[PDB]
Amino acid sequence: STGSATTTPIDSLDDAYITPVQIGTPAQTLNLDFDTGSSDLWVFSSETTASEVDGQTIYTPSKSTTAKLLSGATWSISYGDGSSSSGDVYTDTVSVGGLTVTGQAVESAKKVSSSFTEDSTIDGLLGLAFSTLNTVSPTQQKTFFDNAKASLDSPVFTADLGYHAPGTYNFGFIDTTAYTGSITYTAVSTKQGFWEWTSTGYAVGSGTFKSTSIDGIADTGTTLLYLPATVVSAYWAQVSGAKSSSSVGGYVFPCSATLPSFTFGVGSARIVIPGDYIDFGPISTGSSSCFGGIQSSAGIGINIFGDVALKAAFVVFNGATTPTLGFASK
């Protein structure tokens, strides 16, 4: 089996991407944030506190003939950005881009934090990290990919995120027309539950490549690129007027600037993030100060290759017995 679904930026800044997901029978289609940095599939639902729903599409298990309450199971999650949600659990039929899993744990939200309520475009999350991070208690549940794996033509999924444009998530196959050159594969540690890998270094603009090991996670659910303070300082030093603003919460730069590219290493290969990908627009409406897309991971505790980086590549999440990551230019 395979699946293929289009993923679409939620706004003009690519703050996140939504992908339609069919849940239940008859299908209820919700637009989910596919997140390779977490492992829970959770949804706004008919059970969500009414004041905490503001425009999202909800899952109503009572209207699905294949929904079954997973007796006694609850879930509760906190994300890196301080957001959170919690609730109970159903199993139901879930399909992505034509790929169907029966008996998928669908985590129904009773409560969501304000940042979720305030984002009308995201109806929930579909986690694609390792199932060891799944928060369902007392019986941990498997991710959609983990459930689909054995049925797939190849035990892989791919992320092809667009810059200010739709992209694609594929399950079970590698579209060899979706990238240029070759895919370079690199080792993964699953020890923390993430798609964790080691970049071989970086370059700023047309500068020389610095060979240096940068451990981090490939995380489609994080908007920006979070790297060590040394690396980030070296980047913003090349933008006149750029500075780190504690009041704003990271590096800002004059909106009149032309941003240099940023290159990261994958083995001997190189992925180039164009400067425009690093612009996240005015800090507030009408401001001439713009927020940077490369920020310090100091105080996060881990480096994060978020959408800013991943959207510059065709990325293979290889779920073989020994998982690996592949990156190609496109």
UniProtKB/Swiss-Prot annotation:
Q: What is its EC number?
A: 3.4.23.22
Q: Which residues form the Peptidase A1 domain?
A: 17-328
Q: Which one GO biological process term can you cite for this protein?
A: proteolysis
**The keyword Repressor appears for this protein:** no
Q: Which GO terms describe its molecular function?
A: aspartic-type endopeptidase activity
* Record keywords, A-Z: Aspartyl protease, Disulfide bond, Hydrolase, Protease, Signal, Zymogen
Q: Report the SS bond pairs.
A: 255-290
Coiled-coil regions, chain positions: none
Q: Which reaction does it catalyse?
A: Hydrolysis of proteins with specificity similar to that of pepsin A, prefers hydrophobic residues at P1 and P1', but does not cleave 14-Ala-|-Leu-15 in the B chain of insulin or Z-Glu-Tyr. Clots milk
Name by which UniProt lists this protein:
Endothiapepsin
Q: Which gene encodes it?
A: EAPA
Shown chain mapped onto the complete sequence: 90 to 419 of 419
